[PDB]
């Protein structure tokens, strides 16, 4: 929380196109991305956006497919809103935000065109892959959703599912054949996995990467989910306040542009890192 006069200061700053960090209204801050942090997972990633630190694990397990969709697998999301973020979270107080974020992440992936699940099917109705994604919060410094999305995408990109041949046999005997080639593990495309974008409205001007001090100063925030092409998967609205019908359009256009830029930068970075190799040493928490 904070006072009223500080809110006046911040809103007139935005209206003037400056901010306490001396940046405009369409400028993120240096986001430190890393991948392959944890080892026991089939994929992992970490993000440090200003003062918000997110970790993401991805485990590719084997499970029964879903009766309505046996021809392909599924993603599940869990979100540990560890009290390490702000002590006001505990075994019960973080469930709210965790549930909210998980429901969003689902809503981003009832798209059928983001992760080609057909590539995750072994034997329809009999066996399939399951991507258990596990988000882990460690700080809360705003622009939470965008960082979580970027981490999800970096983790997917860094996911390595092994090849398995599940061979049937009579008298109910099933066999799994591995490929002893950890270098020959498959990779799922992310050319459509979308990034979130949180446009918070302050005064009569909209802003991106709404720091806390500015979230408290706002009244509405439009979440958009964009892909590198320019489409808009999801369009949600969050805030205890109102929102005009016209500003929606500006917010959406800005989300489109910012998504283009963001996806370009992320793709370049992660190709770079994949190029380097074990020479990077995987500096994490050290």
């Amino acid at each position: 929380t904070l006072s009223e006069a500080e809110k006046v200061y911040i809103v007139h700053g935005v209206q003037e196109d400056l901010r306490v960090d001396g940046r405009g209204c369409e400028d993120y801050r240096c986001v430190e991305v890393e991948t392959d942090v944890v080892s026991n997972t089939s994929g992992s990633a970490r993000v440090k956006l200003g003062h918000t630190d997110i970790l993401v694990g991805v485990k590719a397990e084997m499970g029964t497919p879903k009766l309505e969709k046996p021809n392909e697998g599924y993603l599940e999301f869990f979100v540990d809103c560890s009290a390490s973020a702000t002590p006001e979270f505990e075994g019960r107080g973080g469930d709210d935000l965790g549930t909210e974020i998980a429901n969003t992440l689902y809503r981003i992936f009832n798209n059928k065109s983001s992760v080609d699940l057909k590539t995750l099917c072994i034997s329809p109705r009999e066996h399939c892959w399951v991507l258990y994604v596990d988000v882990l919060l460690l700080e809360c410094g705003g622009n939470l959703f965008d960082a979580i999305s970027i981490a999800v995408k970096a983790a997917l990109f860094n996911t390595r599912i092994p090849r398995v041949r599940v061979l049937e046999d009579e008298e109910g005997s099933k066999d799994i054949e591995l490929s002893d080639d950890p270098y020959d593990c498959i990779r799922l495309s992310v050319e459509n996995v979308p990034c979130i974008v949180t446009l918070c409205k302050i005064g009569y001007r909209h802003v991106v990467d709404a720091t806390l001090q500015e979230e408290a100063c706002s009244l509405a925030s439009l979440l958009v989910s964009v892909t590198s092409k320019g489409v808009v998967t999801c369009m949600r609205k969050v805030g205890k306040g109102s929102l005009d019908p016209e500003s929606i359009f500006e917010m959406m256009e800005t989300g489109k542009r910012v998504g283009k830029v963001l996806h370009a930068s992320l793709q370049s970075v992660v190709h770079k890192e994949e190029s380097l190799g074990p020479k990077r040493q995987k500096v994490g928490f050290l």
């Binding site: 904070l2 006069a5 500080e6 200061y9 400056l18 306490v20 240096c30 963001l262």
Partner: protein, 289 residues
């Protein structure tokens, strides 16, 4: 626009760029301070089996006969004249409850807060009800300590009109062990602004006025030429603290003068941060001696 991503680079520890080899006496818990005939203990130690044993990580300080420790990170312990900046948290029937970087909830008694102008007669129930409409929950006060209770809490007051409630400005929260204990925390810099440096870790940054006690809110705009300076000062303070160096007039003034070439935003990128801090540190060190 402009967005940038970058991998994390590994730190460069040991601060070898300085090369000091300090002449101090560091310790850690379990360490045994000098055991001698009747040495008095201070904050940062305890006794066991006729042996003075440290309790906290830092450097030991031996005043004439008193042995104390000076940790490197703590929460503001209450002194008796230290100024302070505070964000209010509650409004009890009798007083206000304020949050400093302290181990408890600081207290401002209704008897302490100055009145509009100099209308001083006494405190009644009408004041008890204006207790809210004037000092809203969440506001900020720039006070000085009045006394410290045996339970640890700090009762603070407002000696004059230079203190009281604060305007709009901006704020930063740093560690309290990164502000040199000196006088005149209230500075008014030539840059075009003014700053308040709490004996706690709360720094306040407000544009300096022209008239020269918070009983009115001047919720007017602020010239761009006086908000850019404030933002630059804010980022410069964040730089200083991120490099673990002390904080006071000359330090911030010189980081300012250093961060003119580098624009108002590109001086949080750790490289720029580090080079500015090094320039400032070197010039302080060489000029002072």
């Amino acid at each position: 626009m402009a967005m940038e991503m970058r991998l994390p680079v590994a730190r460069k520890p040991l601060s070898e760029r300085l090369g000091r080899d300090t002449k101090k006496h560091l310790v850690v818990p379990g360490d045994t301070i000098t055991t001698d005939t009747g040495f008095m203990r201070g904050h940062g130690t305890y006794m066991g089996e006729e042996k003075l044993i440290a309790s906290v990580a830092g450097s030991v300080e031996r005043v004439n006969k008193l042995i104390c420790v000076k940790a490197l990170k703590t929460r503001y312990i209450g002194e008796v004249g230290d100024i302070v900046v505070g964000r209010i948290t509650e409004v009890q029937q009798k007083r206000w409850k304020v949050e400093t970087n302290s181990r408890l909830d600081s207290v401002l008694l209704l008897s302490s807060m100055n009145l509009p102008g100099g209308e001083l007669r006494r405190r009644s129930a009408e004041d008890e009800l204006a207790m809210r409409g004037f000092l809203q929950e969440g506001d900020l006060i720039s006070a000085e300590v009045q006394a410290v209770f045996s339970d640890g809490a700090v009762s603070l007051h407002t000696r004059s009109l230079k203190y009281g409630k604060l305007g709009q400005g901006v704020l930063v929260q740093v560690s309290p062990s990164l502000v040199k204990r000196q006088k005149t925390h209230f500075h008014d810099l030539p840059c075009g602004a003014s700053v308040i440096l709490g004996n706690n870790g709360f720094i306040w940054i407000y544009p300096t006025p022209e008239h020269k006690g918070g009983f009115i809110a001047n919720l007017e705009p602020v010239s761009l030429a006086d908000r850019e300076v404030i933002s630059r000062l804010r980022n410069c303070i964040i730089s200083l603290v991120t490099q673990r160096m002390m904080l006071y007039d000359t330090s911030i003034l010189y980081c300012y003068e250093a961060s003119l070439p580098h624009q108002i935003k590109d001086i949080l990128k750790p490289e720029i941060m580090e080079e500015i801090v090094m320039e400032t540190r070197q010039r302080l060190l060489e000029q002072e001696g």
